[PDB]
Amino acid sequence: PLESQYQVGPLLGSGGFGSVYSGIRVSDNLPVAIKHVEKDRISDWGELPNGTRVPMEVVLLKKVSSGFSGVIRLLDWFERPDSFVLILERPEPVQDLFDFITERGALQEELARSFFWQVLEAVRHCHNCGVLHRDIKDENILIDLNRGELKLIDFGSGALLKDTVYTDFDGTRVYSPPEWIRYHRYHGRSAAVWSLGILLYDMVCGDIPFEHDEEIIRGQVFFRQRVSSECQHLIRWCLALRPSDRPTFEEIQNHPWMQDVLLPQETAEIHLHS
Numbered sequence: 149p150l151e152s153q154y155q156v157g158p159l160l161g162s163g164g165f166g167s168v169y170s171g172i173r174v175s176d177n178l179p180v181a182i183k184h185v186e187k188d189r190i191s192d193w194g195e196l197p198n199g200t201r202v203p204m205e206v207v208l209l210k211k212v213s214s215g216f217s218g219v220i221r222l223l224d225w226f227e228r229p230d231s232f233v234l235i236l237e238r239p240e241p242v243q244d245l246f247d248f249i250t251e252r253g254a255l256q257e258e259l260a261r262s263f264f265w266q267v268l269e270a271v272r273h274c275h276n277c278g279v280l281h282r283d284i285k286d287e288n289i290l291i292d293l294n295r296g297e298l299k300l301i302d303f304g305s306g307a308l309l310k311d312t313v314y315t316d317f318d319g320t321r322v323y324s325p326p327e328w329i330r331y332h333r334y335h336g337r338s339a340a341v342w343s344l345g346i347l348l349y350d351m352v353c354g355d356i357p358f359e360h361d362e363e364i365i366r367g368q369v370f371f372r373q374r375v376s377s378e379c380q381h382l383i384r385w386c387l388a389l390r391p392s393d394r395p396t397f398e399e400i401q402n403h404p405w406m407q408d409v410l411l412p413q414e415t416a417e418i419h420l421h422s
């Protein structure tokens with residue numbers, strides 16, 4: 149610990165989340181990501197099943213840890229006097245969905261379907277493990293290019309999933325639902341579905357539908373690209389103004405636009421050159 153274990157590479161990115169670096173585990177040459185978070189910037193703290201003070205992000209990552217490849221794996225963590233260091237899985241090669249869409253523009257619907265399905269499975273995994281991500285968006289989705297597999301990353305805005313109201317929020321405003329903007333009140337799953345609607349619009353149109361509070365609150369969706377009627381319907385459903393008018397996860401995955409998804413590997417072969 150910690151230098152005898154990891155070789156630090158270049159910075160991948162920094163922001164509200166902290167600073168993430170490329171790295172390699174010295175023992176086996178495993179690609180890893182090394183994420184640093186200042187203690188002064190951590191607003192919620194949790195306790196591990198063994199009783200120790202860690203950031204909520206650590207709690208949430210451990211709750212979702214499994215063989216399931218749809219969510220990033222926390223491999224190790226360290227406490228420093230002024231920060232926490234998270235050792236995370238790193239697919240190689242990888243590209244985040246924001247960069248992917250920036251490069252390629254609006255995605256073919258077949259590709260968007262495969263990607264969006266995988267995100268749905270990942271988010272359902274989180275919720276099933278009692279975790280609410282709260283920052284679902286293109287930047288927080290990694291594409292494992294060889295395997296055509298998507299990974300949800302950055303649980304730094306997340307919370308334990310509850311059935312009561314959330315009155316706090318620190319994810320991305322332009323993915324946040326109208327009830328947050330207007331009332332500073334939302335429920336977990338229905339807000340999650342809102343952000344999934346933004347994401348899906350983003351995949352098929354190449355950009356997000358709303359930039360300003362007034363637009364989010366109005367909820368009028370305009371399609372700037374050719375999008376099929378079935379996809380438009382699903383997007384408009386996820387983006388229903390009334391939270392209770394939004395589809396459940398089951399209804400999303402049962403939607404006609406979601407039928408006949410490609411497997412991850414088929415997705416890679418067809419769309420990722422692989």
Ligand SMILES: CN1CCCN(c2cncc(-c3cccc(/C=C/C(=O)O)c3)n2)CC1
Pocket residue numbers: 160161162165168180181183220236237238239242243244287288290301302303
């Ligand atoms: C939100 N992102 C902003 C865009 C640049 N950035 C990147 C870019 N490419 C890979 C990773 C990368 C690779 C492996 C694991 C992780 C996990 C990060 C996390 O869990 O916060 C991230 N992160 C930092 C985070």
